Each structure stands twice: as structure tokens, then as C-alpha cells.
Design a protein around this ligand. Structure first.
Ligand SMILES: O=P([O-])(O)O
Length: 275
């Protein structure tokens, strides 16, 4: 029943929002470029529309990344799809080279699964649990995963523990889920109480920053401790090849990078038999 999400012996490299540093975030121009650059999958976010259809989108409003205005929850999928999701992407020249071009449109989570059936999906449920969109999003998320037979290649996480709570009750543990911050805090507590005898019963991915308020979280003993706790350690914001090799040798299993170009370089270093 447990999903075999992690296969092989090489850590998965994810492009942050499809590789937002090089191409407009959440657009096909980004997913195509990152996939060409040799990434293992896409880190992404989902928002629910008025049609109750999940779209690949980060902000609650389309103002930052499109030519439109307003919340995604107030727009239809048809209205959202007339917008240019590359309208505000600027290169270092100051130009917007992808404004008005093809493949600059918003995508639904359904079309993302059908179009890239070989990529791993690390998806974030963004809508708050208190909201109306957040109540029905976990179910719609599972239905989309279920309709595309992608139980073993999608990782559903959230900043809110309750969204992971509500997705996991529907998914029956048939889809890998991210670890909440409260669950890790109470994992450390049951460790000190029960000694090293404790481990988490179900493996969950805990994605971390490489640094937080001056505190380095790349300690080899911390990564080893998490693995001994049966907590799968991962890191986002990894934008150098030496840090990628460092986390790979310490035991991290997921890497989210804004720079998908380094993924191809990382893969050349590792052997093909590990995959
Ligand atoms: O997609 P992120 O920016 O919420 O990690």
C-alpha cells in the first residue's frame, strides 16, 4: 500500500516552480527547459479556481505573474487561461522576452500530470484550511492524482499541517506526504523521552532551508539523525553544485533548486546505475 515514491539510490532534484530563475514560474516554458536541463521533477504549488479546478500557481492573486488582477478563487479557468503568465518575467536586460509568446499560459494540475508523465511532482497545497477553496482542494488533489494513476510519482505537502492531515485521510497513505513542522517537533520530543529507541512509524519528507536565521541546517549528524528517526530529509533553495554534492553525500534525498542547470551537471558526476 505504501507508495514507492523514492526509487534508486540518487536524490531527486526538483526545479523550483519549474525553475523560476530561468523561465517564467509555473509555465510550460519553465517545465520544458528544466526537463531538458535534466531535473528529476518539478516543485510546484496549486490553487483552486471558481470552477474548483486546481491550477499550477503560487500566489492567491494573479497580479504578480500575469497581466490580470484579482484572486484565483474569483476567476474561472477560462478567464485565467486568457492571461499571460509570463507578462512580468524580466531578464537582466530589463526586457520581458516571454510576454505575449507561446506556452506562457497557466496550467492546471491535471494537464501537468498528463503532459509530463515521467516527472516527479513535489506539490504544495497553498489554499488555507479555513478557506472554502482549502476545504475541497485535498479531495480534488487526490482525484486528479487518482485519475492519472500517478500515486507513486507525486509528493503532496503543505505549510499547514491540517492540509496534510486532510489529504492523508483521503489518500489512505497511498501518496507520499511531506512532514509538518509540528510532527517533527514532537518527533524530537519522543526521541529525548524514549531515547534513541524511537523512530517515526511512517516515513515522511521534511523539506528544510539550508539556513535559517544564521543557523546552518546541513549538519551531517542532523541529516543522519533525521534518517534514523525515519524522517526523509530534504532541502530547498540549493543553488550551487558543491552544496548539491554535499547534501547528496550526507544523506539528503530531495533537492529543490531555483537553478535547474546544475541538475545536469550533478547527474554527470553520479553513476547511471544508481537511478
Ligand atoms: O513553491 P514555494 O516557493 O512555496 O516553495
Amino acid at each position: 500500500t505504501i507508495p514507492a515514491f523514492f526509487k534508486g539510490n540518487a536524490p531527486y532534484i526538483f526545479a523550483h516552480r519549474g525553475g523560476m530563475a530561468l523561465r517564467p514560474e509555473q509555465t510550460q516554458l519553465a517545465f520544458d527547459y528544466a526537463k531538458q536541463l535534466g531535473v528529476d521533477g518539478f516543485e510546484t504549488d496549486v490553487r483552486l479556481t471558481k470552477d474548483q479546478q486546481l491550477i499550477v500557481f503560487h500566489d492567491a492573486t494573479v497580479d504578480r505573474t500575469t497581466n490580470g488582477s484579482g484572486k484565483v478563487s474569483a476567476h474561472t479557468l477560462a478567464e485565467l487561461k486568457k492571461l499571460d503568465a509570463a507578462y512580468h518575467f524580466k531578464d537582466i536586460n530589463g526586457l520581458t522576452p516571454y510576454r505575449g509568446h507561446a506556452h506562457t499560459a497557466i496550467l492546471t494540475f491535471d494537464e501537468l500530470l498528463k503532459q509530463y508523465p515521467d516527472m516527479y511532482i513535489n506539490v504544495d497545497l497553498k489554499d488555507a484550511p479555513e478557506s472554502y477553496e482549502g476545504s475541497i482542494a485535498p479531495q480534488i488533489m487526490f482525484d486528479t492524482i487518482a485519475e492519472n494513476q500517478a500515486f507513486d510519482r507525486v509528493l503532496v505537502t503543505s505549510f499547514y499541517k491540517e492540509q496534510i492531515v486532510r489529504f492523508n485521510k483521503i489518500a489512505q497513505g497511498s501518496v507520499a506526504i511531506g512532514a509538518s513542522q509540528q510532527e517533527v517537533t514532537e518527533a524530537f520530543l519522543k526521541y529525548h523521552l524514549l531515547g534513541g529507541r524511537y523512530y517515526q512509524p511512517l516515513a515522511q519528507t521534511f523539506q528544510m532551508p539550508t539556513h535559517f536565521k544564521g543557523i546552518d541546517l546541513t549538519s551531517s549528524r542532523f541529516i543522519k539523525w533525521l534518517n534514523d528517526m525515519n524522517i526523509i530529509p530534504g532541502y530547498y533553495g540549493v543553488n550551487s553544485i558543491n552544496l548539491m554534492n554535499d547534501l547528496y553525500q550526507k544523506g539528503a534525498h530531495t533537492i529543490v533548486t531555483d537553478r535547474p542547470d546544475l541538475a545536469q551537471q550533478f547527474k554527470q558526476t553520479i553513476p547511471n546505475k544508481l537511478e
